Amino acid sequence: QSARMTAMDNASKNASEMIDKLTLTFNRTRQAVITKELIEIISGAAAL
Amino acid sequence: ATLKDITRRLKSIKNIQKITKSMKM
Amino acid sequence: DLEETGRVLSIGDGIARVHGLRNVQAEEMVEFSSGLKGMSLNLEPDNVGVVVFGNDKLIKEGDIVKRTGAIVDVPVGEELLGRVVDALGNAIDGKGPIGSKARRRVGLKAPGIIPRISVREPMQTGIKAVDSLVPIGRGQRELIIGDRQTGKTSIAIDTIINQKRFNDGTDEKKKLYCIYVAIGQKRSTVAQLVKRLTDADAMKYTIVVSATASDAAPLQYLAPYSGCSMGEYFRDNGKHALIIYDDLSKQAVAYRQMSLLLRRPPGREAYPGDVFYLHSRLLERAAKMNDAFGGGSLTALPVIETQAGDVSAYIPTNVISITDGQIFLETELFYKGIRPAINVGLSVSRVGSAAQTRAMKQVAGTMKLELAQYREVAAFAQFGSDLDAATQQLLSRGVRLTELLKQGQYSPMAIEEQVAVIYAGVRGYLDKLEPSKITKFENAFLSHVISQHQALLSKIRTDGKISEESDAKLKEIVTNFLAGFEA
Amino acid sequence: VPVGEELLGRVVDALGNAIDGKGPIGSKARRRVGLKAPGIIPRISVREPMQTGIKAVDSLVPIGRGQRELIIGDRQTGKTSIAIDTIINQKRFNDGTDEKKKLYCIYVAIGQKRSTVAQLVKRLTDADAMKYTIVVSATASDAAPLQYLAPYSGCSMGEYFRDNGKHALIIYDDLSKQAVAYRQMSLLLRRPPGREAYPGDVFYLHSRLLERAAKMNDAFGGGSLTALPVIETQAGDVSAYIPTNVISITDGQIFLETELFYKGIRPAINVGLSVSRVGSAAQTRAMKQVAGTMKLELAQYREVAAFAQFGSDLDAATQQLLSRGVRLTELLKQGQYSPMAIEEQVAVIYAGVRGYLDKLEPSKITKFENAFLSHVISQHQALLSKIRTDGKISEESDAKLKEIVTNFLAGFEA
Amino acid sequence: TASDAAPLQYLAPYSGCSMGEYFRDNGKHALIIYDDLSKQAVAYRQMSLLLRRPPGREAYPGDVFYLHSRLLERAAKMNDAFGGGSLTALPVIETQAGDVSAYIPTNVISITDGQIFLETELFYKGIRPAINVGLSVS
Amino acid sequence: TTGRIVAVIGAVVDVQFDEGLPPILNALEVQGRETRLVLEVAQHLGESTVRTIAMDGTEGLVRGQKVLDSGAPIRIPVGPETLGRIMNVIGEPIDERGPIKTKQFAAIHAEAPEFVEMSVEQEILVTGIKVVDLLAPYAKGGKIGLFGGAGVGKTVLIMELINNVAKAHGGYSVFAGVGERTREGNDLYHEMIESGVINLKDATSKVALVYGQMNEPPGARARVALTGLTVAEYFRDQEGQDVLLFIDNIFRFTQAGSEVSALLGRIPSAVGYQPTLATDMGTMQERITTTKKGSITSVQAIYVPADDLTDPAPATTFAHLDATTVLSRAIAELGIYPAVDPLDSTSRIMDPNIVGSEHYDVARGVQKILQDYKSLQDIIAILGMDELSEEDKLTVSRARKIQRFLSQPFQVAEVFTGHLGKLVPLKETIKGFQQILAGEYDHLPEQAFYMVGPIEEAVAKADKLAE
Amino acid sequence: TTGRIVAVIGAVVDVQFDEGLPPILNALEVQGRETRLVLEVAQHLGESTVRTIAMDGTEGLVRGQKVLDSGAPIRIPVGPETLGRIMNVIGEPIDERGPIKTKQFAAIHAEAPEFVEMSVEQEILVTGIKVVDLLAPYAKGGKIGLFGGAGVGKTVLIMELINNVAKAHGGYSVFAGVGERTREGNDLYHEMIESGVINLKDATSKVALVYGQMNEPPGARARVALTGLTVAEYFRDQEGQDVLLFIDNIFRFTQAGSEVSALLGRIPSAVGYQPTLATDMGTMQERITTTKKGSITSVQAIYVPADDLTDPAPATTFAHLDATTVLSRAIAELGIYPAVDPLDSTSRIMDPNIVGSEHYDVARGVQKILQDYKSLQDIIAILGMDELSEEDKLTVSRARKIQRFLSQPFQVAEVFTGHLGKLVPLKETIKGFQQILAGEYDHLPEQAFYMVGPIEEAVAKADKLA
Structure with a gap:
């Protein structure tokens, strides 16, 4: 019971950390897709 | 790195964290 | 004459570039030889970029364009009821001309800040989840948002159907005329839609403005304004009106298409810098007036289609940011059996209880709370190898309350029927019942009280709340019915 | 451009000019680089196999003549190797008598590096394969328009054989660098960039080309053109726009993964994601007989192998499924430059598919296949020549085979 | 500052650098602090988008690395034959969410001769200066 | 009318008419070609020049080439x-x-x-x-x-x-x-x-x-x-x-x-x-x-x-x-x-009023369980399966079998599956799923449910697999 | 100056001046409109024309319409x-x-x-x-x-x-x-x-x-x-x-x-x-x-x-x-x-170098305690409120007193709470919390501190709460 407690403390703390990282990775990606998709539109439009 | 996949992973880790914090207590 | 008329310099992709027309005003309706109309959206130094309202096969270089001098206005008032009209108010149900006296202008400014008053009258949908946890009041603007096929239009339809309870009634301050705007939809869908409404005898109090898939961009663009005007005639005249925009996503696309073809600058997702302003000026025309102005109202149910649940994409962000709350639908929920797919945790009603009845509040309130509580623990269930009976309790209330929010389509309920059923689980009566049976219980339980007990419901209704008496009567009614039920 | 038999064994640039400084080409025929592919009426369903020499491919994603099969994967996952082994495997028939079984090859290098190509034509020479190969080279320093044209050029040289009742095989290595060339040429002409910066017609750029690989009916010579275009993915992402653009033109794909490669699975063919839209119609009956259901079996194996990466109280039907899956996976492994003969493939797959190896240790399997194949090739060429000849596995051959494997296997596990 | 036209924010670091250069050039020793090169970069990008130059990674113009290399190459240690003087630059760069891989941060790391990364975690936990001793370098 | 080609760039050809400008959508035929080349008018650029899309290859066209308005789409x-x-x-x-x-x-x-x-x-x-x-x-x-x-x-x-x-x-x-x-x-x-x-x-x-x-x-x-x-x-x-x-x-x-x-x-x-x-x-x-x-x-x-x-x-x-x-x-x-x-x-x-409640309850019944299993997938992935409630490891079971019972050998893909194509009748379908959902086959192995037609083939296949 | 409208594209109006061009940022008034239409200037396109942004609907404008430079923003x-x-x-x-x-x-x-x-x-x-x-x-x-x-x-x-x-x-x-x-x-x-x-x-x-x-x-x-x-x-x-x-x-x-x-x-x-x-x-x-x-x-x-x-x-x-x-x-x-x-x-x-050590320490005292209690919160509910130390039971008590002492009645909500609003002074604020931390009111009960102003009121409420 003391080892399951310890193991589950860690697991839970790793999870949260993973959560915090994926979230930040998500926003970086979200911003780059918009920027990326918009530059693509501008390039096409300017070439005309 | 797909907003879809990223979201899929967050989904399953938020539950893990929840079930895992419970098991600790 | 280059002052009152022009000549087409070039025509393509539905954009006409007219030379002349020196006197046209911005957004003025003009006419091409062939008879086609067009609206002047770009008044440039050397030309007028005209938005053609139809097939540009009928326009050639040199065609003569003349001004109408008139700005876009549409038919309005009570004769449109039970009719199917295009974005210009023309009848498309082939039932004969609309006998319209008054004509209103499609784009007008929303009623200012002074002419209104707090949204206070309930706008009932007949959907328990909505009516108890995401209350809509008259004058409110509540968005229905979700991915493709999640149940969005069904919410609106059940809502429209539901108003017959008051439209067949005598109290004229409870009647709500309905307006359904279909933008970018295929004609078979609307045809199917109007059928379902006819079959429920809701067309009598409904107007259908339809700008479908094959109608030129500009008509799809306008549709929502021209439908808005129609609903304003009611609002202004001490009458109440409900309007459904299905969808604002397709109209945004229509607008983007003209913007880019007129070559205006494109921003994120290729949307023009004024796309936010296109919806805000539309969704603000919905409001609750003051008695000084007639006390009339205009409630709006705008639909936005998200993608892969990206509520932060551009258009979903604007409209969420403009409206008073959102009903969020989800596929996962839908396929898990929760229909309607309302995600109760993320849905909202800025207006809130200011729009719930005392009867509902009497129940809505504790339900809202045990649910929020379940939501905290829910995830544990499936691995709850040994949870204390404290939380094990909330899981049970959790799944039963959830089963009570379920609902079939085309069968909106009377506020009194909803509280009677909600009372049942909220009070704990279905706690020992099997989750698998709540759907069956309610159905039959409600069949029973709608049959045998129309005097208690009439009380609840009238007294507007659950008296200590009716409370006791319900206790017995459910404790004897339940006994019956598990025999 | 120049076209015809004179080019065989020669290295030409994107216009036909020799670059092996071995003299002028003695060309008598010419052909427009850009000709529409033969229509509906002039062709006949792909039915003759195009043997690669690679079990994994010839058994799971069969290639027939007139077929277009794509080799796709990240840098260094082995895409070119598939193509070389294929060119080399053709000596078998080319050194033979039958002219219908012969296959002339064309290898188009695009955007590649001259020393790599030089390395490439060396190996082909050392394998005595140049004799039937033409190499159109449009490398890294060649002008964008040469790199762009190169594929159409090489195609036209292949149609010469296709339109004359002969058989040709063309490798477009790779169609990724060509797209870049096209993109460059195109932007410099001021044509508005489109999705991902490429011309709005990059699909068209490749469809037009690959539609030309085809099987003509006897009314048109019965000749054919088979294409093996290569495309480079990034971060093994096959859903990518270009990757799918090309996957939606060819008659299947061979997807190579670096994960599998590092793991020891070479070729790194990803069973599940690779396909052949020709199916068994491009397979000999011997092969169809042994590998008829193997593909979906291995797909279903990869799944459960994942579903029990935790031995979840697993029954027998799935323990058997995992036991076959692993053994079969080892047999599909293969080294380089040693294309096997069809009957050789049938012998070894046979052993696995029939369960005779379900009790051998996975680690043993590779060694066993070298031992076993040795035995049958040396001693039993009568069974190999019959399976090969009849082209099928008769009831007695199937009985002579059961006998050999089971007994050799036993002596083998002494 | 925050209210001066972008061109002035853009210019500012070059001017200060020239002032530090007088000392470097005369056997003297100066210290220049560019706070921050992050905001100078956005000022220059505003200029570049307004001039219509192709926006690239993070909408930054293709020459933002040079905006910085030219500037920071001027910090330097002369030898005796040139005065022995020197210019030391401590440029500041602001990362978002501790992301040191972003375009601008990386640019600048590929120019200077080490970094001093301060961590938010450290800062709250009470370690200040919030220096990250493993990541930082000289 | 007769126009001339003034510009060729890929599939797009601009044509200049001297008199009589063909309306948009009109088809024009290019004169002087071994094969019929039709150009559909796409736009009126002005200056009596129309921009068109070629219905075929534009190779060999020449500036100045003649083009006749066919007078109709x-x-x-x-x-x-x-x-x-x-x-x-x-x-x-x-x-x-x-x-x-x-x-x-x-x-x-x-x-x-x-x-x-x-x-x-x-x-x-x-x-x-x-x-x-x-x-x-x-x-x-x-x-x-x-x-x-x-x-x-x-x-x-x-x-x-x-x-x-x-x-x-x-x-x-x-x-x-x-x-x-x-x-x-x-x-x-x-x-x-x-x-x-x-x-x-x-x-x-x-x-x-x-x-x-x-x-x-x-x-x-x-x-x-x-x-x-x-x-x-x-x-x-x-x-x-x-x-x-x-x-x-x-x-x-x-x-x-x-x-x-x-x-x-x-x-x-x-x-x-x-x-x-x-x-x-x-x-x-x-x-x-x-x-x-x-x-x-x-x-x-x-x-x-x-x-x-x-x-x-x-x-x-x-x-x-x-x-x-x-x-x-x-x-x-x-x-x-x-x-x-x-x-x-x-x-x-997919309406009870149209296909019936048996059809409808089965369908939705099958979808709930596949959804229920989708959600658990990512989690038993890491945390494994032991901690799961027998109630929940049965839905993993049934789901995995349904997932299979949904596959089917097509009659047009024998070259692909190596299996004879099966066509199952609506009632054989509804029933088969109804039973899996009912627990009536929790004994047969998943594999028995893969690539089969009607539920009886899943039962037969179990035996064949029984060894 | 009087300019004309040369173009109207959505909410962007271009105005051409014959003599005298308004500087950027000036406000121009459109002539002949039911209501006031102010066009702010944004650029000098050259050729005597300015590019402005309308402050309200440009619906109806006409090329040639008259515009009067108000000669200022x-x-x-x-x-x-x-x-x-x-x-x-x-x-x-x-x-x-x-x-x-x-x-x-x-x-x-x-x-x-x-x-x-x-x-x-x-x-x-x-x-x-x-x-x-x-x-x-x-x-x-x-x-x-x-x-x-x-x-x-x-x-x-x-x-x-x-x-x-x-x-x-x-x-x-x-x-x-x-x-x-x-x-x-x-x-x-x-x-x-x-x-x-x-x-x-x-x-x-x-x-x-x-x-x-x-x-x-x-x-x-x-x-x-x-x-x-x-x-x-x-x-x-x-x-x-x-x-x-x-x-x-x-x-x-x-x-x-x-x-x-x-x-x-x-x-x-x-x-x-x-x-x-x-x-x-x-x-x-x-x-x-x-x-x-x-x-x-x-x-x-x-x-x-x-x-x-x-x-x-x-x-x-x-x-x-x-x-x-x-x-x-x-x-x-x-x-x-x-x-x-x-x-x-x-x-x-919140820097001692700015709010002074006292202020800074109290504040940092209030938060830690509030943090610690947060920790215990998990324990209390599960394993029950008692392995709690003579120490762990005090951090909670005080924390819970603090949490309440941090709440307060607003004079804005008097027409409604039927209660009198409190505007506690900074001095009173630091003292208040100082003492709770200190242990001066550990005997006082929680609810003594709910919705009050200065600590003095926490004391008096206790009295009325027997």
Whole structure:
């Protein structure tokens, strides 16, 4: 019971950390897709 | 790195964290 | 004459570039030889970029364009009821001309800040989840948002159907005329839609403005304004009106298409810098007036289609940011059996209880709370190898309350029927019942009280709340019915 | 451009000019680089196999003549190797008598590096394969328009054989660098960039080309053109726009993964994601007989192998499924430059598919296949020549085979 | 500052650098602090988008690395034959969410001769200066 | 009128007329060519110059070349003598069997049926495919869409439907190949013949064919669907018959347009698409429809670029359908064919009032459990399965078996599966699932449920596997 | 000067002048229109033509229409007679109480306080709110990020601050609704009225309201925060008070900026915002400070897009914030109000070198205890409240006393709570918490501290609670 407690403390703390990282990775990606998709539109439009 | 996949992973880790914090207590 | 008329310099992709027309005003309706109309959206130094309202096969270089001098206005008032009209108010149900006296202008400014008053009258949908946890009041603007096929239009339809309870009634301050705007939809869908409404005898109090898939961009663009005007005639005249925009996503696309073809600058997702302003000026025309102005109202149910649940994409962000709350639908929920797919945790009603009845509040309130509580623990269930009976309790209330929010389509309920059923689980009566049976219980339980007990419901209704008496009567009614039920 | 038999064994640039400084080409025929592919009426369903020499491919994603099969994967996952082994495997028939079984090859290098190509034509020479190969080279320093044209050029040289009742095989290595060339040429002409910066017609750029690989009916010579275009993915992402653009033109794909490669699975063919839209119609009956259901079996194996990466109280039907899956996976492994003969493939797959190896240790399997194949090739060429000849596995051959494997296997596990 | 036209924010670091250069050039020793090169970069990008130059990674113009290399190459240690003087630059760069891989941060790391990364975690936990001793370098 | 070519850039050709400017949509014929080259007028640039899209290769055209206005949009031979034949974008036989002697000719461009012409009858159309039938039933006269990225089963699925439905259908069928593989039109033609749906000797042909494959210039690809659809509208209106329309693949119509778009001088909309995508799709999709005159049962294959269902094209097409079959490479990858996604496929008739509550409760019953299992997947992945409630490890069981029972060996994919094709009747389907859901087979092994027709084959297969 | 309209494209009007071209930023009036149409100038396209952005619908304009250079940027009635009135972007009345009759007019586009006007020091501005003043002290002239929205007392907190600024600093406040929902403004109006901050009968209004409704074109929702700014600058540069500026919400300011930018055809930058995101913000934020004459303090409602704190809009904004006031629904649920979060809310000036060691230590004392208790919270519920030490049981007790002592009755909510509002002083605040930490009231009971002002009241409530 003391080892399951310890193991589950860690697991839970790793999870949260993973959560915090994926979230930040998500926003970086979200911003780059918009920027990326918009530059693509501008390039096409300017070439005309 | 797909907003879809990223979201899929967050989904399953938020539950893990929840079930895992419970098991600790 | 280059002052009152022009000549087409070039025509393509539905954009006409007219030379002349020196006197046209911005957004003025003009006419091409062939008879086609067009609206002047770009008044440039050397030309007028005209938005053609139809097939540009009928326009050639040199065609003569003349001004109408008139700005876009549409038919309005009570004769449109039970009719199917295009974005210009023309009848498309082939039932004969609309006998319209008054004509209103499609784009007008929303009623200012002074002419209104707090949204206070309930706008009932007949959907328990909505009516108890995401209350809509008259004058409110509540968005229905979700991915493709999640149940969005069904919410609106059940809502429209539901108003017959008051439209067949005598109290004229409870009647709500309905307006359904279909933008970018295929004609078979609307045809199917109007059928379902006819079959429920809701067309009598409904107007259908339809700008479908094959109608030129500009008509799809306008549709929502021209439908808005129609609903304003009611609002202004001490009458109440409900309007459904299905969808604002397709109209945004229509607008983007003209913007880019007129070559205006494109921003994120290729949307023009004024796309936010296109919806805000539309969704603000919905409001609750003051008695000084007639006390009339205009409630709006705008639909936005998200993608892969990206509520932060551009258009979903604007409209969420403009409206008073959102009903969020989800596929996962839908396929898990929760229909309607309302995600109760993320849905909202800025207006809130200011729009719930005392009867509902009497129940809505504790339900809202045990649910929020379940939501905290829910995830544990499936691995709850040994949870204390404290939380094990909330899981049970959790799944039963959830089963009570379920609902079939085309069968909106009377506020009194909803509280009677909600009372049942909220009070704990279905706690020992099997989750698998709540759907069956309610159905039959409600069949029973709608049959045998129309005097208690009439009380609840009238007294507007659950008296200590009716409370006791319900206790017995459910404790004897339940006994019956598990025999 | 120049076209015809004179080019065989020669290295030409994107216009036909020799670059092996071995003299002028003695060309008598010419052909427009850009000709529409033969229509509906002039062709006949792909039915003759195009043997690669690679079990994994010839058994799971069969290639027939007139077929277009794509080799796709990240840098260094082995895409070119598939193509070389294929060119080399053709000596078998080319050194033979039958002219219908012969296959002339064309290898188009695009955007590649001259020393790599030089390395490439060396190996082909050392394998005595140049004799039937033409190499159109449009490398890294060649002008964008040469790199762009190169594929159409090489195609036209292949149609010469296709339109004359002969058989040709063309490798477009790779169609990724060509797209870049096209993109460059195109932007410099001021044509508005489109999705991902490429011309709005990059699909068209490749469809037009690959539609030309085809099987003509006897009314048109019965000749054919088979294409093996290569495309480079990034971060093994096959859903990518270009990757799918090309996957939606060819008659299947061979997807190579670096994960599998590092793991020891070479070729790194990803069973599940690779396909052949020709199916068994491009397979000999011997092969169809042994590998008829193997593909979906291995797909279903990869799944459960994942579903029990935790031995979840697993029954027998799935323990058997995992036991076959692993053994079969080892047999599909293969080294380089040693294309096997069809009957050789049938012998070894046979052993696995029939369960005779379900009790051998996975680690043993590779060694066993070298031992076993040795035995049958040396001693039993009568069974190999019959399976090969009849082209099928008769009831007695199937009985002579059961006998050999089971007994050799036993002596083998002494 | 925050209210001066972008061109002035853009210019500012070059001017200060020239002032530090007088000392470097005369056997003297100066210290220049560019706070921050992050905001100078956005000022220059505003200029570049307004001039219509192709926006690239993070909408930054293709020459933002040079905006910085030219500037920071001027910090330097002369030898005796040139005065022995020197210019030391401590440029500041602001990362978002501790992301040191972003375009601008990386640019600048590929120019200077080490970094001093301060961590938010450290800062709250009470370690200040919030220096990250493993990541930082000289 | 006679115009001259002034500029050639790919599939786009600009023409200058001296007198009389051909209206937009008009077809012009280029003079001086071994083969017929039609140019569709796209725009009036002004200065009596029109911008047009070529219906074929532009090689060898010359500045100054002559061009005659045909005076009308592309018009094709329409009528019963189109059946058993193979046509072009421009209506020319391409089967080498001589002229198509029709009484009439129709212009491929036309307005879509009015709102008062719509019909609302809704009859389930049984196909024999477990998944479709169970969960996303097709409807007679309805609009059906098969969505899928490259190589996931769109065409094979269209192939088995032609077999299980087109073949018994008493009425015509029109199969329009839009921008797909030439090899494929040759496979189908010869299959139609070998099975008598196409008769080369008599007038018993029950299928007309129209083709504008991937080896064509954007222009042809932007119009074949129109030609195809036009042939079909004739049998709907002028004969009043029950038509079956197969289009593979309608995405190609939209990709065609995006390919010339820039040469038409337009600022790109998002994802590279042209700004008129939706309207371009609308005026077309709105003709592919059942009316009071006749009935069309359209089965359209819909390509999904980069596998992204949100891509402006696939995304814009959902609204035009009454039933949708979404295929997924993630399912296919597991060897589950047809690779339909059970939680992303829908039908407008999945209504208790239309298919019945037994049909409906099973379907939804199957979907809940697959959803329930989807959610657990990522979690037992890491945390394993021990901690799960026997209640929850039974749904993992049943789900995995259903997942399989949903696969089926198609009769058009024996070359693929090495299994004889099975066609299951609607009641055999409903029942089979009803029992799995009921716990009536928790003893048989999953594998017994993979690649089989009716539930009895799963029971038999268990024994065969029993050893 | 009289120009003509040469082009009208949406909300962008081009005007050509024959003699005399208006400088950039000037306001032009369109001639012959039912209502006032102000066109702000944005560029000099060359050839005597200016490119402007309309401040209202251009519907109906005609090429050739006449335009009169007002020879100056948008100017508005400034001063006392604005207090309690509701005003437009171009300083017009939208409350229908007749003309805003002031003596001075103030152009909205103004530069900011030269360096030599800057104050050189950091001073806390006291509001009288125990949480705010104890853990996240506002700063004079600083900018505060107010997080949290509905249900959590946002509008009552905005209204108590107003009142408390009038009370303790004799300073007035302005309210700029940038992109306000017409429904919500009218509701804000009557709510201030009912609580008095606005008085329609007398001249005791302590707020002037400036509105930029959501229907207004980009340019209008773009400038209204400047207009509100103009007004506030008066009560500082003309009457040297300590004004309060409320911009609701700071995100719609930025968005309005992008719309305007896009309309002027400029290439967007990262994430689609304007190339000038940082300058558009800086030219406004910087006018908010403490000059030698007085100071403007701004409470800015922040909306974070995509919950992404590194999104360019939000990220830029924090560059200027000196503190955040996080309203929390969770706290509210404890009944605790103001529902400010004592651990999530922050302030730049919480430095002993600025608030002084005492203040700094108490604050850091309150938070740790609140943190520790947070830890135990998990234990208590599961393993039950008792392995708890003579020590662990004290941290809880006090923490729970503290949590309550941090709540408080607002004078704004007297018409409703039937209770008397409290404006606790900074001194009283630090002492209060000092002692609880100290252990001086450990004997007192929890509920003695719920909804009271100064600790003295915690004592007396205990008495009445026997």
